[PDB]
Every structure is written in C-alpha cells, then in structure tokens.
Amino acid sequence: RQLVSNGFEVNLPDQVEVIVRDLPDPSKVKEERTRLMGYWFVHWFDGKLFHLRIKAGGPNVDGEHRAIRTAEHPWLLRARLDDALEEALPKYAAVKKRPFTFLAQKDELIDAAATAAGLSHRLLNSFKVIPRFALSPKIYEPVDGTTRVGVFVTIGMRYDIEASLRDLLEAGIDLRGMYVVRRKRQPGERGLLGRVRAISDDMVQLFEETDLASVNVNDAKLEGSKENFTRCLSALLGHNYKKLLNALDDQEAGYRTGPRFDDAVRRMGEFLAKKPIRLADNINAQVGDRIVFSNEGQARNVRLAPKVEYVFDRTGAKSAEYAWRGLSQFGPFDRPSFANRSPRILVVYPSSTQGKVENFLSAFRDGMGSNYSGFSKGFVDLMGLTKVEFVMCPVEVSSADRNGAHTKYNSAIEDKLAGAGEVHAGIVVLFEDHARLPDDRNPYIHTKSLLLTLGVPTQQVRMPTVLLEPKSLQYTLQNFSIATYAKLNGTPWTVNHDKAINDELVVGMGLAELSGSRTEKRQRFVGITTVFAGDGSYLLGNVSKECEYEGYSDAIRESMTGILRELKKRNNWRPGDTVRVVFHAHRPLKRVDVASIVFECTREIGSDQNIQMAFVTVSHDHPFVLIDRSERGLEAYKGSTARKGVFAPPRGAISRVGRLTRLLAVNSPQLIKRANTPLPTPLLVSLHPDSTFKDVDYLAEQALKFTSLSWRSTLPAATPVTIFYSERIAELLGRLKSIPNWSSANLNIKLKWSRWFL
RNA sequence: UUACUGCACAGGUGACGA
DNA sequence: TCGTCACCTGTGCAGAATAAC
Ligand SMILES: [Mg+2]
C-alpha cells in the first residue's frame, strides 16, 4: 500500500521577513556575501539579492522589506537549510557542501573487516573505508499544487589510501602505472597528478601528467580507486585478500541493505530531530515524520505498473514475462519472415586458440545439451534457422604482440574474404592482452572497422569468455545469441503496448566522451535511436550514422521530421488522428530547442492532426531512494537463511515527487544479484515543463518497458534502449572516425537493418 | 570486447536565470 | 560572465557456484 522514502519532512515557518535589492550584476554577489557574512544569509535569484538576517548586529543592508511565504517560494528556506544543516552538526566536518556531506566519526570498515576475517598487516591501518552521509534539502509535492521541503539522507563510502608511497614500494608493490592524486588539494584545483613512472627521489616522475612532471612523495597519494586497493592489497595479503574483500563487503551491507539503510536513515532523523534547527537567531525548523508515497487522504502518489510482457508474435498470442523463457518456447518474434535461414559467419581467431574456439562454436551453434538447460538447443534451433556455416579465419598472432596484432587480424580477414563469397556476420576472438590497447593498435576496433566498412556486423568475444566454465557459458551464449541474431537483422522480441493513439514515436539521444587517456581532453559524440508504436508492440526503428556533438539539436529535429513524414505516408493518418512524440535523454533539453523541435514537428505533420509532445530525462544519480517495508526479499542461496532484495520495491512501482517528476523502481528482489547488494536506487523520470503531453506516469511506465527492449542481453537494461543504444552507437562511431580506412557507407545500405551496435 | 548488477575513484558538465 | 541547482561520463574490479526461471 505504501512506499517509504529516505527523507524527512522539515517544518518551516509560514513566513520569513527579508530585505531585497535589485542586483542585476551577479558578479557583485561574491563580495556581498563576504561583507555581511555571519549576520546575513544572502541569495541571488532572478535579478534580486535576498537578505535573511541570521544574527543581530550590523552591517546593515538597504532594500525593500518584503515577506516571503514558504508555501509560495520554498527556494529561499531550502537554500538556507543547506547551511543551517551544517551548523546543526558542528562536530561533523563538511567534505562537501550543497549537499552537506560528512564522514562517520568512529566507524572504519577495513579495520572492522580485517578483524572479522582474522587478518592483519602493518599497513592495513593506512587503508580506509569510511561511511559518508549526505543531507539533501529537496522540494517535493505531497499533493498537487502544494510544495514542501524535505531532507533526504544518502549513504556511500569514502575509500582512501593515506599511506606514503615510500612504504608501498618498500613493501613489494609495483607502483608503476598507478594514478596519483594530491594529498592536499589546492583551492578549487585539480586533484589528479598523473601516473608514477619511477622513483629515484622523494619526488616522483610522472607520465600522463596533468601539471608539471614532478611532485614530492609527500604532496602525493594513490587515488582511492578500487584498482589501487586490490593491486595494493593482493601484494600485501594475497592470495588471502579475497577474504578481506568479502569481509569488507559484509561491513558495507551493514549500511546499505534495505533494513540497515532504513535504520541508518531513522537514526539520522532521530539525531536531527533532537533539537530544532536554527534558521536564524529566532526562527526554527523542525525535522518531522519520514516522507512517504501513499494514496492516503487526497494524495495519489504511488502506483504499480503491470509487468512488462515480452511478446513473440504480432497477434499478441505468444507472450511471456521473461525474455528467455519466451524465446525458447516460441522462438523469435520475426521468425516467420526472417530472410536468411542459412547464414555464413566468418570466425577470426588466433590460430593457437583453435581448439578452444571450435568448442565455443560447437556449443553456440548446436547447443550444450540437456545438462546445461540455460543453453541446450543452440543457436540454429533456438532462432529457427536452417543451419549456420562457419568460415574459419585463423590469424598467426601472439598475445605478446602488442604493436602488430591489429594489422595481422586485418590482413587475415582481407585475404580470407577475397576468395570466399559473401559472409553475413563475423565472430572475432580477442586475446585479453589486446582488448584494451590504444585504438591505433587495438584489434577490436580495427576488425570492427574493416568488417563494418564491408557491410559485415561482428560479435566479438574475449578468450577468458570462450573459456568460461559451462555453468556460466550457457548464460553468455544466451546474450551472444540474441545480439548475433539482431546483427543478422533479426528481431528477437518486442514488448507489449496497447495504442490509445494512431501513432507514437519515441526518439532518444545518448552521449559518449572519447579521449586516449585521462590527460587528453575528451571529445563528445552523439547517437540517435527511434522506436515506433506498432499493433501491440514497440518496434525498433532505424539508427543514426552521423555522430558529431556540434549541432545535435538540429539532428534530433531532422530525425523526427523525417520519421513523422514517413509514418504519415505508411499509416495514412486520418483527419483528427492524434500523433504523439516522446524524447528521451539523460539530460534535459534547452527550452529553445524544445520550442524549435515542437515547431518543426508541428509544421511537418500539419493541421489535419493533433500532435502531443513530451521531453523526458532519465536520471540515475539523485538523492532519492524507495523502501518497501512489506517486502521480505528472496532466499539467496541453498541452505541460506540470508535474503536478497529485502525492502526492495517491486519492478514498476511509480512514485510521485512532484508535478513533473516520478521515481521508477526497476530492480526487483528477483533481479537483485546478491545478499549484500544495496537497496536499489530508482530511476528519476522528469518531464520538461514546455511539454504539451503531461502524463508522466505513462512516460515513466514507457521507460520501464523500454528497459526490457535491449537485445544486448536477456536481462533488462538499466536505462531505456532509446538512450542505451544511442550511447553505444555514439562510442562506436566516435572511435571509428579515427580509424584508417573506416567508412560509414554501408551503415545505411547493407547494415540498414542490422543491430550492429549491440 | 557475452552481459547484468554493484561500488569506487577521477574528470568535470548540464539546465535555468539576470 | 556570473549565481544557483543539479548530476553527468569514463574506468576497473568482483559476484556466499552472478545469469529474473
Ligand atoms: Mg555487444
């Protein structure tokens, strides 16, 4: 019935007396906050400076003496609450402001976990994992039209390596190549320094340096990355350190699992409620009841969308609630019409892996048999094909080759394809040592580039994957198979939809930011994905091939007007039919581009039809989480009383935060991985205020459905494919643009229907 | 680069205003 | 060209046999 938040009501005064000055130049703000510090809280907003006296005593300030009512303009006290919260907890130092973020004072989980696993070492004490809390004052709407201010509590972990580098070398750890950051960060300065090349002195030489190429061991520390944690801890504890890691894992679950997260939030609120918070020398705020999402009173703030249906035919008849159960039963959605029932697949691999590749190939095509029910039938039978012909392309290359692997792959491919006929896809096997080389010598991107130029999509695979034990291999081959079929132009499945309106187009934009290393400046690229309403089905449209970030707003416009025009011809809209267009991205569009897009789409479809348009952003990293106390979770393992997903809301729960925003739960207990998996964070779905379509509950459920549309895997994706696919297109095309002999000519010819980006 | 999930660190960035 | 609110993207590691069943 009810969903509990991680936030607390804040009781504020109805009203606060203020002094206002017009200050059209906001540069002035800096100095004025200083001149009046301590006596005045100061705030700029729409051309005016607002002054809230906090302590008696000059300096005095001029301006109009206006009252500000909290119900009408809650931004004022919300901002003041950022500062007030810090001052209410003066024993807890801010490591970050707005939101106020601070460290637990006693608990330190590496010590705790070493003790708990029975481990010790003289440098452990310099490895620290400390709980970090943030208190975020946010405006929300308990019912439509009335605003309130809540305080939302979030929990993470500071990882830090405070050990001096002299010790870590002397203890047996190769520092070479690790990233190094400033111990003491310079006022609004960069922290990262570079990577350690060597040490011959108290100063260390750097490569991939951000500043000067030298700094003192006492100005520098390792960054608190996991990489540096495991590299350092394996080379001081191993191979026993895995016992530490899971011990550490056990400790953090003590702050992040549902019940334990709910408890820490409760205790934070009890602490914050003990006194009143001092907004000013005689005005008080009071932290109150835990905020809830419910349908009690006049509130209609929680709902549960129905389960998504994976659908495998166009009459609606062949549906399932899980993609893979649906695929095995029915075979793929487009099986009746699928054109090429005998595909020829190039398989490019190091000659010395031959036997391993043949067994992976045999399992993929013909299956693993009934002892491995995850992948019994194999690709040909799973997808309803006649057969699959493999064209073997061994490459005489060794994992130690670091400079010429790519040219050897590309020469082998070229010489093999010149005799042979047409191949319809390829499989490229990569050595793990080659997978992450720089792109100028990386065989993943060069073989991808060569084969895409020729109109051949590829499914690549790293040797550690080819060698997976059978219990995992079966799942690997489910995803491998779904993406290969899609790259052969197949459609594995759709998700259900009942059209209220005569046509619905969703288009999404994604971003990728590319650089050779953490020093070089990242270059932005974009991708565009389209999805169409069908008869009971969401259908994946075509996909961008141009990827430059400069001008992306015009590219959104062209793809929409072009698709609308084509949809009108196909479907032959009647006078009075309603067309709906939805846009998806991880960031909001500018108002001016919304206006430009509405205008062009409105003109394109013309006056015979009604057009509805909605502009949506999907956020993952916000201060909101949802707790379902009625949820006991699931049994994790055999002989395991321990549970997973305890308090996790169900997949499809949609909570109202305000008029334009919903919280969307995607990871149910069924999908949560492990007993120690944190309480999941829901997606935040936000509607652009200039949208002409306003039903964000519907848009929240549409985004949910689009997570189930991913053909990269049998399991749902963490964001709708409108965005996800586009990010994958953007990164690929971005990388390919710099590869010699890359050409996009075939992306709209041979690859027009290929899901080559999966 | 089979993926899902999680976390960490780093870089910063976006939208709205005058 | 600043204030203010907000959180995005890249990378690397690991999974109480990781894989909705
Ligand atoms: Mg892929």
How would you characterize this protein structure?
The chain has 758 residues and is α+β, with helices and mostly antiparallel strands. It has a domain of 244 residues: Nucleotidyltransferase, domain 5 (2-Layer Sandwich), CATH 3.30.420.10. Strand 6 and strand 7 form a beta hairpin. The protein is globular and about 90 Å long. Bound molecules: magnesium ion. Magnesium ion binds next to loops. It comes from Cereibacter sphaeroides (strain ATCC 17025 / ATH 2.4.3).
How many beta-strand runs? 35
What is the CA–CA distance across the termini? 39 Å
Q: Which cofactors or ions or other ligands sit in this model?
A: magnesium ion
β-strand amount = 25-35%
Structural class by helix and strand composition: alpha+beta
CATH topology of the domain at 494-737: Nucleotidyltransferase, domain 5
Region (N-terminal domain): 1-88
InterPro entries: Piwi (IPR003165), RNaseH-like_sf (IPR012337), RNaseH_sf (IPR036397)
Region (PAZ domain): 164-224
Cofactor: Mg(2+)
Question: What's the topology here?
Answer:
Layout: E1 3-11, E2 15-22, H1 28-35, E3 40-45, E4 48-53, E5 64-69, H2 75-87, E6 94-96, E7 100-103, H3 109-117, E8 127-143, E9 146-161, H4 165-170, E10 179-182, E11 192-199, E12 203-207, E13 214-216, E14 220-222, H5 226-237, H6 241-256, H7 258-273, E15 277-280, E16 283-293, E17 302-304, E18 310-311, E19 319-320, H8 323-330, E20 344-350, H9 354-366, H10 379-382, E21 389-395, H11 405-419, E22 425-430, H12 443-453, E23 458-462, H13 463-466, H14 470-487, E24 494-495, E25 503-514, E26 523-533, E27 538-543, H15 552-571, E28 578-585, H16 591-605, E29 610-619, E30 626-627, E31 634-635, E32 643-644, E33 653-658, E34 661-664, E35 683-687, H17 696-707, H18 721-736
Parallel strand pairs: 20-21, 20-22, 22-23, 25-28, 28-29
Antiparallel strand pairs: 1-9, 1-16, 1-30, 2-4, 2-5, 3-4, 6-7, 7-8, 8-9, 10-11, 10-14, 11-12, 12-13, 15-16, 17-33, 18-19, 18-24, 25-26, 26-27, 29-35, 31-32, 33-34, 34-35
Helix pairs in contact: 3-6, 6-7, 11-12, 15-16
Bound molecules: magnesium ion (MG).
It binds a DNA/RNA duplex (18 and 21 nucleotides) through helix 1, strand 3, strand 9, helix 5 and helix 6.
